[PDB]
Enzyme design. Structure first.
Site, PDB file in Angstrom:
ATOM      1  N   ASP A  52       0.898  33.159  54.733  1.00 53.70           N
ATOM      2  CA  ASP A  52       2.198  33.451  55.349  1.00 53.70           C
ATOM      3  C   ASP A  52       2.852  34.722  54.862  1.00 53.70           C
ATOM      4  O   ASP A  52       3.890  35.113  55.398  1.00 53.70           O
ATOM      5  CB  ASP A  52       3.121  32.250  55.183  1.00 53.70           C
ATOM      6  CG  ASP A  52       3.575  31.891  53.786  1.00 53.70           C
ATOM      7  OD1 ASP A  52       3.215  32.571  52.801  1.00 53.70           O
ATOM      8  OD2 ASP A  52       4.336  30.901  53.650  1.00 53.70           O
ATOM      9  N   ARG A 102      11.118  30.596  54.827  1.00 50.38           N
ATOM     10  CA  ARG A 102      10.384  31.062  55.997  1.00 50.38           C
ATOM     11  C   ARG A 102      11.265  31.170  57.225  1.00 50.38           C
ATOM     12  O   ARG A 102      12.484  31.018  57.126  1.00 50.38           O
ATOM     13  CB  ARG A 102       9.228  30.064  56.176  1.00 50.38           C
ATOM     14  CG  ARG A 102       8.083  30.286  55.218  1.00 50.38           C
ATOM     15  CD  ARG A 102       6.967  31.230  55.752  1.00 50.38           C
ATOM     16  NE  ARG A 102       6.488  30.707  57.040  1.00 50.38           N
ATOM     17  CZ  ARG A 102       5.668  29.657  57.071  1.00 50.38           C
ATOM     18  NH1 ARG A 102       5.184  29.244  55.888  1.00 50.38           N
ATOM     19  NH2 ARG A 102       5.316  29.069  58.207  1.00 50.38           N
ATOM     20  N   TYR A 161       5.608  25.672  47.064  1.00 49.52           N
ATOM     21  CA  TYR A 161       4.372  25.539  46.275  1.00 49.52           C
ATOM     22  C   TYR A 161       4.793  24.661  45.086  1.00 49.52           C
ATOM     23  O   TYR A 161       5.757  25.007  44.419  1.00 49.52           O
ATOM     24  CB  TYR A 161       3.812  26.847  45.773  1.00 49.52           C
ATOM     25  CG  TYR A 161       3.260  27.751  46.846  1.00 49.52           C
ATOM     26  CD1 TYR A 161       4.103  28.558  47.584  1.00 49.52           C
ATOM     27  CD2 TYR A 161       1.904  27.816  47.126  1.00 49.52           C
ATOM     28  CE1 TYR A 161       3.616  29.409  48.549  1.00 49.52           C
ATOM     29  CE2 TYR A 161       1.407  28.635  48.117  1.00 49.52           C
ATOM     30  CZ  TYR A 161       2.271  29.450  48.811  1.00 49.52           C
ATOM     31  OH  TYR A 161       1.777  30.288  49.791  1.00 49.52           O
ATOM     32  N   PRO A 195      -2.181  31.624  45.319  1.00 48.41           N
ATOM     33  CA  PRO A 195      -1.219  32.156  46.280  1.00 48.41           C
ATOM     34  C   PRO A 195       0.133  32.492  45.695  1.00 48.41           C
ATOM     35  O   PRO A 195       1.084  32.740  46.448  1.00 48.41           O
ATOM     36  CB  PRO A 195      -1.137  31.020  47.313  1.00 48.41           C
ATOM     37  CG  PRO A 195      -1.252  29.802  46.445  1.00 48.41           C
ATOM     38  CD  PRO A 195      -2.148  30.143  45.284  1.00 48.41           C
TER      39      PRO A 195
HETATM   40  C1  LIG Z   1      -7.115  25.673  53.840  1.00 48.88           C
HETATM   41  C2  LIG Z   1      -6.433  26.928  53.337  1.00 48.88           C
HETATM   42  C3  LIG Z   1      -5.189  26.930  52.795  1.00 48.88           C
HETATM   43  C4  LIG Z   1      -4.567  28.108  52.382  1.00 48.88           C
HETATM   44  N1  LIG Z   1      -3.340  28.099  51.869  1.00 48.88           N
HETATM   45  C5  LIG Z   1      -2.777  29.192  51.512  1.00 48.88           C
HETATM   46  C6  LIG Z   1      -1.383  29.141  50.945  1.00 48.88           C
HETATM   47  O1  LIG Z   1      -0.805  28.096  50.688  1.00 48.88           O
HETATM   48  N2  LIG Z   1      -0.823  30.377  50.552  1.00 48.88           N
HETATM   49  C7  LIG Z   1      -1.504  31.562  50.704  1.00 48.88           C
HETATM   50  O2  LIG Z   1      -0.979  32.652  50.563  1.00 48.88           O
HETATM   51  N3  LIG Z   1      -2.783  31.562  51.231  1.00 48.88           N
HETATM   52  C8  LIG Z   1      -3.420  30.450  51.623  1.00 48.88           C
HETATM   53  N4  LIG Z   1      -4.654  30.503  52.160  1.00 48.88           N
HETATM   54  C9  LIG Z   1      -5.547  31.707  51.956  1.00 48.88           C
HETATM   55  C10 LIG Z   1      -5.492  32.655  53.117  1.00 48.88           C
HETATM   56  O3  LIG Z   1      -5.169  31.994  54.341  1.00 48.88           O
HETATM   57  C11 LIG Z   1      -6.530  33.730  53.191  1.00 48.88           C
HETATM   58  O4  LIG Z   1      -6.386  34.463  51.980  1.00 48.88           O
HETATM   59  C12 LIG Z   1      -6.254  34.666  54.362  1.00 48.88           C
HETATM   60  O5  LIG Z   1      -6.300  33.919  55.626  1.00 48.88           O
HETATM   61  C13 LIG Z   1      -7.333  35.757  54.473  1.00 48.88           C
HETATM   62  O6  LIG Z   1      -8.580  35.173  54.575  1.00 48.88           O
HETATM   63  P1  LIG Z   1      -9.875  35.519  55.355  1.00 48.88           P
HETATM   64  O7  LIG Z   1      -9.496  36.118  56.670  1.00 48.88           O
HETATM   65  O8  LIG Z   1     -10.701  36.448  54.584  1.00 48.88           O
HETATM   66  O9  LIG Z   1     -10.484  34.058  55.559  1.00 48.88           O
HETATM   67  P2  LIG Z   1      -9.925  32.750  56.253  1.00 48.88           P
HETATM   68  O10 LIG Z   1      -8.491  32.918  56.516  1.00 48.88           O
HETATM   69  O11 LIG Z   1     -10.502  31.615  55.428  1.00 48.88           O
HETATM   70  O12 LIG Z   1     -10.746  32.705  57.637  1.00 48.88           O
HETATM   71  C14 LIG Z   1     -12.189  32.455  57.685  1.00 48.88           C
HETATM   72  C15 LIG Z   1     -12.492  32.144  59.162  1.00 48.88           C
HETATM   73  O13 LIG Z   1     -13.924  32.126  59.332  1.00 48.88           O
HETATM   74  C16 LIG Z   1     -14.352  30.860  59.717  1.00 48.88           C
HETATM   75  N5  LIG Z   1     -15.659  30.508  59.214  1.00 48.88           N
HETATM   76  C17 LIG Z   1     -15.977  29.987  57.988  1.00 48.88           C
HETATM   77  N6  LIG Z   1     -17.261  29.784  57.863  1.00 48.88           N
HETATM   78  C18 LIG Z   1     -17.826  30.202  59.022  1.00 48.88           C
HETATM   79  C19 LIG Z   1     -19.148  30.251  59.458  1.00 48.88           C
HETATM   80  N7  LIG Z   1     -20.167  29.836  58.695  1.00 48.88           N
HETATM   81  N8  LIG Z   1     -19.360  30.742  60.688  1.00 48.88           N
HETATM   82  C20 LIG Z   1     -18.333  31.144  61.455  1.00 48.88           C
HETATM   83  N9  LIG Z   1     -17.066  31.121  61.135  1.00 48.88           N
HETATM   84  C21 LIG Z   1     -16.835  30.687  59.921  1.00 48.88           C
HETATM   85  C22 LIG Z   1     -13.241  29.875  59.759  1.00 48.88           C
HETATM   86  O14 LIG Z   1     -13.164  28.905  60.682  1.00 48.88           O
HETATM   87  C23 LIG Z   1     -12.012  30.687  59.501  1.00 48.88           C
HETATM   88  O15 LIG Z   1     -11.397  30.740  60.849  1.00 48.88           O
HETATM   89  C24 LIG Z   1      -5.265  29.321  52.561  1.00 48.88           C
HETATM   90  C25 LIG Z   1      -6.539  29.294  53.092  1.00 48.88           C
HETATM   91  C26 LIG Z   1      -7.105  28.161  53.466  1.00 48.88           C
HETATM   92  C27 LIG Z   1      -8.428  28.315  54.239  1.00 48.88           C
END
Ligand SMILES: Cc1cc2nc3c(=O)[nH]c(=O)nc-3n(C[C@H](O)[C@H](O)[C@H](O)COP(=O)(O)OP(=O)(O)OC[C@H]3O[C@@H](n4cnc5c(N)ncnc54)[C@H](O)[C@@H]3O)c2cc1C
Ligand SMILES: Cc1cc2nc3c(=O)[nH]c(=O)nc-3n(C[C@H](O)[C@H](O)[C@H](O)COP(=O)(O)OP(=O)(O)OC[C@H]3O[C@@H](n4cnc5c(N)ncnc54)[C@H](O)[C@@H]3O)c2cc1C
Lengths: 656, 649
Positions: free
Chosen positions: B54, B281, B289, B351
């Site tokens: 967020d 928010r 948290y 986070p």
């Molecule tokens: C469950 C959860 C809770 C979180 N809570 C917080 C919070 O409280 N506070 C905070 O600041 N941050 C939080 N975050 C962390 C944050 O959202 C990430 O740091 C941010 O979204 C950037 O991540 P990313 O894009 O690199 O990966 P992500 O945001 O994890 O996205 C990965 C995407 O790729 C996909 N994926 C995974 N494996 C595969 C595969 N094998 N094949 C195809 N697609 C795949 C998924 O479905 C997901 O849509 C949380 C993340 C998660 C997942």
């Protein structure tokens, strides 16, 4: 062929800027009381661009902000910033003699901006869709054929005194002429059109089956049907003024010029070929107002371009792309009357027509229905007495006369030949012109309006000195404040959402002072009492900030006093954080000195009552509770079941 | 099983913030060269709808703005404004001992704001559809099953070195998030809402059937599949670090509390029950948290203990999770500069400073333009090495910062002056204030590398334009009409490099001589402008040459600068002024940029908005050398400027 009959609370005739603002404002009252039936008709198709305006002035934007419309319009509109003045020199070549601000510094937090009228409408159309839950929509093509008013039922809340006979037109009847020109042009809309032709072109032709003729019984009718208003002509409302033969042409184009200030607003007075006004627009367009009975068939872009070339000499001027164009004569017109029984109203161009030299039309016309709208809405939902409808005409007609007076002179200075030398008395003095423009810019912002004392504007009961820059009858000017909840620095005018509520702005002053806090608590005890305006005017079990919104702006730094040091819930509502603000220093901005900008004493404060509209209507002290009661008693209607005295425990203390 | 085979230029695995930002940046190169095939897949049926990431920090917002995505986001997000620090008394009662700014004054024209991840996703999804004219779409739910890399083909431009085997998943084999899309009360629907809702249905790309297995030959693959990355795991890159025993819960709720700073960002260290961080928010929600010791009730029970004696109840609950305090980072971000990893796939942390989504989008913002220029034949392949050189060191500094900050946040506050196990509240405050500079994302300084030239710079000519740091926006006055504006709005991210010409005191005859000589270079046959812009293409379409001078606009005209080199034909977004204007004082922008007001300077900015070269108007040879190591010359160059001065009749 089909004959039908129905009833409606409001009928808006005309879906231009005035009509759409009327619908947008009324939409809020329709969402609160969904039985209310508000209709808005237009007689034109949407296949010929139906518009011509582009400027939005400071108070229009403050109002659009309060309707949730300004940020979308501002993300596309262009701020012209500067007005560059050009006039002939010794040898008669045009050169820049000066530059003045397009908006006057400090006049408003919003600057005049320009944008295609169709995008402005789209945004208003989306908002109406949202606020009315898609329930209010423009019906077209439809046209009134008869209007019958029963003046004996005028004060009856149950009656339908205005009977409107509507004809359902054909697509061809609703389509305006284009006079043989390829480029989309609004010479139909143009003011060269004649009201005769306006009615004659949308007329049920000869081989004539009206598809449907509807008899609509209306409680109220708002005529927002333009310059040649049929609603106005049928009420018999004369219109004083006379049209010159100064004729100008308008080009909306992507220019190709070496003129140094082609992207700035400019005034160009050429030695003998006429004037030009440049209005720089969004997406590389530039609007050119070029000075030139008239045969509109022969009025082509080419003629306008040839004249612009003469005026720009010796700079070059060519059109890379031409989106639209029009023509207009210089003339001013105004009516004396805006209302027939406070049942049939006219607004917008229907009431005042003038030149576009200060782009005032769409602005004034939306501000007219912004004014009428809340008064009609409160009447229609049973919240206010019918007598407040008289204030529409009392406030807006004098404004239209001042508008026509300003345009009368400004358009003539703009259309005259510049004085060659000082002896040339029949030329236009360029110094007088500059003076008129600078002075005109205050008026044209729309922010200087001062409404005369009336039922919703109480000067007589005010102690004006307690809030010297909050002059009763003028718009409550926004000033930076610091929201106490988290310390967010913001323009306080963002907080005055237009939705039918009046505000009580409580300038609490130096709240840490024991004597000042005593006055604050006594004021909140009034608010909590059985017969205050809050207890009387908010329906039983409704939110106590849902009719009259009580906001507190204090003078302390938020490190020195808490929100829970103010009476709760009178001033510090349960679990709600949009009520306590501070005139203090903050992380990214210095102390805004807002009490001072508002003319209010920092220690003792004041109480300022603002209309639904954003106009200040009463100024008193914390002890002036009797003046607050009297102000609201003459306007509001008590709900069937009152909220009564505040009965909730202080939520900040209470244990759960 | 149905089997299929196809080819693609880029495959993005993962449609979270990282992946979407990669798609968004690649969309622009796809619009320029429509044959390019960029795909982006995801294993979850729908986009996120609630919670998760967020926070949006300063540099992210500056970048989002350059991508046309900040104002839409800013119209909904909340600026937390203050951080209120609460810690126990002598009698162990929590009370506010201080308040610090949530964003450091002067650090950027954007402040940190908060808005849940579903909104962001919505927005980058709409941007993607608009820039790529609906050509780039998220294909889901699809999941890679195998990845084969042919390293002997790594440097062949025509090869497809990475073979991905994808499987089309069924509705019931994809795992849905518990706080999914919620239908909107009413009949009215905006497009967000409408997009949100169709995104909420399961739906394979068209014709594909659950069970279908596709062999995809890829030139490049970007793994943005999150903290548990399948791509990084397959590559064998170890996630180095430790997971503590500290466990926290998260609640996105409309609170019912008497806590005085419930709507402010807060740090709460309770005497013995753990810490809370409050993140206020949009739309009345507040994110909490809450340190634990599971379900929402367990998290609420613990928050009630930490808030003592203030009250804490939930009026409504929009999302929830739990995690362990831990930090992990990889040493490598690339395999042959063919398969990259980005985002949580390379770095996971707590986070407490909401750095995840921020850092992850900045990773693919960095990788994207490099991949884009390589794919369109505009830049050499060697620039791809700079992704890892720049972003992995940043991930290590992120984990180091989180390592300490999360531990100070999760420890019990020191009672006494002697309480050494306890956390010193004064140390905590220092860490937060110092963390806020880092966490803004604005202090990054890239080490010298192929696209960052410190050695050939005369840094002193632009002292607050440090090579390797982001080119900081400063207010300027557009000369065309006198519009006062943040100059960073002018640096639209679309693959162009910029040459910022600080013309200095242009009315000076000597300074105008240098300016004209510079413009004669630009117009010359072999300048970077003539060499790197394709024949008959606009001369600001590859390298964008912008002039910021020091005079008032009443003292010099736009047409007093060389046209069309610096004053392009009928175009008015090139000449700006460091001057006084109707509504604002002289911004003193040259001084904020540390550039001499008379003499000026020449600053080269990457597509990314990071400064990469600082010289003077005579340093044309340094400009040639800088671009020659990066850009590939088009087959048919524009050559010397041959247009007449358009301003002269
Ligand atoms: C469950 C959860 C809770 C979180 N809570 C917080 C919070 O409280 N506070 C905070 O600041 N941050 C939080 N975050 C962390 C944050 O959202 C990430 O740091 C941010 O979204 C950037 O991540 P990313 O894009 O690199 O990966 P992500 O945001 O994890 O996205 C990965 C995407 O790729 C996909 N994926 C995974 N494996 C595969 C595969 N094998 N094949 C195809 N697609 C795949 C998924 O479905 C997901 O849509 C949380 C993340 C998660 C997942
Ligand atoms: C060239 C030009 C430029 C201008 N530029 C500006 C500017 O920048 N800023 C500004 O503020 N103003 C400008 N104006 C003025 C402005 O265009 C008008 O003042 C404004 O549109 C008035 O709005 P209105 O809603 O009252 O009427 P109109 O805009 O005329 O709309 C009336 C509507 O009612 C309809 N209608 C008419 N008769 C009937 C009927 N009998 N039954 C049903 N429907 C009917 C229509 O078809 C029309 O949609 C400009 C005017 C011109 C001539």
């Amino acid at each position: 062929t089909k004959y039908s009959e129905s009833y409606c609370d409001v009928l808006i005739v005309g879906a231009g800027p005035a009509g759409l603002m009327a619908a947008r404002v009324l939409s809020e009252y329709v969402r609160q009381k969904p039985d209310l039936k508000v209709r808005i008709i237009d007689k034109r198709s949407t296949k010929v661009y139906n518009g011509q305006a582009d400027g939005l002035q400071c108070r229009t934007l403050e109002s659009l902000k309060n309707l949730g419309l300004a940020d979308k319009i501002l993300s596309e509109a262009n701020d012209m910033s500067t007005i560059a003045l050009y006039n002939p020199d010794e040898n008669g070549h045009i050169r820049r003699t000066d530059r003045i601000p397009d908006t006057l510094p400090g006049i408003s937090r919003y600057h005049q901006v320009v944008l295609h009228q169709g995008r402005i409408e789209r945004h208003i159309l989306d908002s109406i869709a949202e606020i009315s839950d898609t329930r209010i929509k423009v019906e077209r093509p439809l046209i009134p054929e008869k209007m019958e008013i029963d003046s004996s039922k005028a004060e009856d809340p149950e009656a339908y005194p205005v009977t409107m006979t509507l004809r359902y037109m054909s697509d061809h009847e609703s389509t305006p002429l284009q006079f043989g020109h390829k480029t989309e042009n609004s010479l139909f809309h143009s003011n060269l059109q004649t009201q005769e032709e306006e009615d004659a072109n949308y007329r049920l032709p000869e081989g004539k089956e009206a598809g449907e003729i509807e008899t609509v019984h209306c409680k109220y009718v708002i005529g927002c049907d333009g310059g040649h208003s049929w609603v106005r002509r049928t009420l018999g409302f004369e219109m004083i003024g006379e049209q010159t033969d100064y004729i100008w042409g308008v080009l909306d184009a992507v220019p190709a010029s070496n003129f140094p200030d082609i992207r700035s607003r400019c005034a160009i007075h050429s030695a003998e070929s006429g004037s030009i006004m440049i209005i720089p627009r969004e997406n590389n367009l530039v609007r050119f107002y070029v000075q030139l009975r008239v045969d509109r068939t022969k009025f082509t872009p080419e003629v306008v371009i040839a004249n612009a070339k003469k005026i720009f000499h010796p700079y070059t001027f060519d059109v890379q792309q031409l989106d639209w164009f029009t023509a207009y004569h210089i003339g001013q017109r105004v009516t004396e009357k805006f209302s027939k029984d406070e049942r049939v109203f006219i607004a917008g161009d229907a009431c005042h027509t003038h030149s576009p030299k200060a782009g005032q039309g769409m602005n004034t016309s939306m501000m007219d229905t912004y004014n009428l709208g809340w008064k009609l809405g409160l009447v229609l939902t049973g919240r206010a007495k019918r007598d407040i409808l008289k204030t529409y005409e009392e406030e807006r007609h004098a404004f239209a006369q001042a508008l026509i007076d300003f345009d009368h002179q400004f358009s003539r200075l703009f259309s005259g030949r510049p004085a060659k030398d000082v002896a040339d008395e029949m030329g236009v003095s360029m110094d007088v012109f500059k003076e008129a423009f600078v002075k005109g810019n205050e008026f044209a912002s729309g922010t200087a309006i001062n409404y005369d004392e009336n039922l919703v504007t109480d000067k007589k009961s005010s102690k004006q000195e307690l809030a010297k820059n909050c002059v009763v009858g003028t718009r409550f000017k926004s000033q930076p404040v610091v929201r106490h909840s988290e310390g967010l620095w913001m323009h306080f005018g963002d907080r005055l959402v237009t939705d039918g509520r009046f505000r009580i702005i409580v300038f609490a002053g130096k709240a840490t002072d024991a004597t000042q806090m005593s006055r604050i608590k006594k004021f909140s005890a009034y608010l909590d009492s059985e017969n205050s305006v809050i207890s009387l005017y908010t329906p039983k079990v409704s939110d106590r900030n849902s009719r009259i919104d009580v906001i507190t702006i204090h003078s302390c730094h938020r490190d020195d006093i808490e929100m829970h040091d103010f009476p709760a819930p009178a001033l510090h509502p349960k679990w709600q954080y949009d009520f306590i603000y501070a005139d203090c220093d903050s992380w990214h901005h210095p102390h805004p000195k807002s009490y001072q900008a508002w003319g209010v004493d920092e220690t003792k404060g004041a109480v300022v009552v603002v209309r639904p509209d954003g106009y200040t209507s009463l100024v008193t002290d914390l002890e002036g509770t009797a003046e607050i009661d009297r102000y609201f008693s003459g306007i509001l209607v008590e709900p069937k079941e009152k909220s009564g005295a505040q009965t909730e425990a202080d939520w900040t203390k209470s244990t759960a």
